[model samples]
Target: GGSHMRGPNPTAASLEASAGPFTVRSFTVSRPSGYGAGTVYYPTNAGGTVGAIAIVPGYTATQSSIKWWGPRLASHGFVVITIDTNSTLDQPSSRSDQQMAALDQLASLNNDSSSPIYGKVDTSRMGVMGWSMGGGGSLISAANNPSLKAAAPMAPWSSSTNFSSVTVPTLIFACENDSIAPVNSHALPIYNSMSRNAKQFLEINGGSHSCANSGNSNQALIGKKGVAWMKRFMDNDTRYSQFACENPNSTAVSDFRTANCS
Candidate 1:
């Protein structure tokens, strides 16, 4: 609710099911003594396998707002990290600096092979997801980053280059009637430039791009699809099939379930 971030609906609320054997804990990453100190979350499953994710907030968003996704991913067996980027609209030059710094930390988890997880994480399966400006920033990162495996951008803004350059599996979750980042106008131009292979696009009919918050809670598909995107792309589970198996023409609101990747 500060000037830097948008306030979520006061009536908004998120529900969590019981966490399994997995543990969700909070952590911060900084240069040993205190350099670029940033927040990171550790989600440890009994199996010790770790799926890492980096979540970016929409325009004018700070880390606090992005914090919700951290534990959510942890509950599902992932080490989730959220970055609080500088929220200056006219100052677009440093978008990379804020986002890359976060991913850099997620990558560090792989270095200590001696850890209990011991590379169970297919680091190559790393994924990033963002909203609005953050969404567009992810595309910029994917275009330049070969290590980035998959990305889901919700109502991302457009630019001069190709959004399709994100070659790894990509999911575009967007709002159909949104004029702010109208898919047909802004995102489409970039989508047209994409390779189109391994690319999937979803438009939430009754939802706003910010459905991550409860105000848009009525927009069930956006939130459900996002969860599915992560499971399928980062965890390599096919059961996430229900995510894409939707009747696009219908206004069906469904709760998400995991794919038994095994």
Candidate 2:
């Protein structure tokens, strides 16, 4: 009875769409607090205050690498901030810190009446997402802050693969042919290490390291899974449970595995 449900009940076609029910608006952060720069996307009328999510880019990547997630997630009823790390060469640990800093700035904007996102964020229910090493950073964010509701990392890369301590619900998007961060060595091992929380691994067939990044051809499926996971875990919306937990079994997905995601 206490679910923070928003938007209409989801459907495969609905979530698969490029945008959701809410009308989205965005603003560039005039003075980024802890990160290099950020663009915040939010729904003007999402029915109520919604959770905030922060996304980071990988090594030598700019916000453009992950900026598509801004409207994609925000239109589905979230305040999403896609950011650039203070330095392009920042490591996973530093990226994780900057990701949290972006979340912190979003929280501050929620309380600043002069800000466009004022009173639009429920800071307690936050999520993290990223690409490549930034994807690895997303995992670090979840591990350090168990209170975060969910994490979705795409083709993550990190020196350490043991994330057994992460309790946050996570969805790792893997590219079957990712030479940069091969699924076997990076994504698979990381997913296998986390058994304490609900997690899922979706590997795209014939995909490369940028399979889950913006402008990918499989947006319909990738977007659907990303939104579903956040809705089910971050919002605790039971309507999304099936979508979040079930295997799509599509030709696009080469391998799929899920644990504790009933």
Which candidate's lDDT is highest?
Answer: 2
Error of 2 at 199 (Å): 0.3
Report, for all candidates in order, the number of backbone clashes.
1, 0
Tens-digit lDDT string for candidate 1 (43-152): 55435455666767666666665566666656556666676664545122245455666665566655666443345454555677667776787777677775765677
Local accuracy of candidate 2 as per-residue lDDT tens digits, 1-262: 3689999989999999998999999999999998999999999999998999999998999998898888999999999999999999999999999999999999999999999998999999999999999999999999999999999999999999999999999999999999999999999999999989999999999999999888998999999999999989989899999999999979999999999996
Off by over 4 Å in 1: 1-21, 30-37, 87-93, 109-122, 213-215, 218-220, 244-262
The C-alpha RMSD in Å for every predicted model, in order, reads: 9.0, 0.8
Model 2 residue pairs with clashes: none
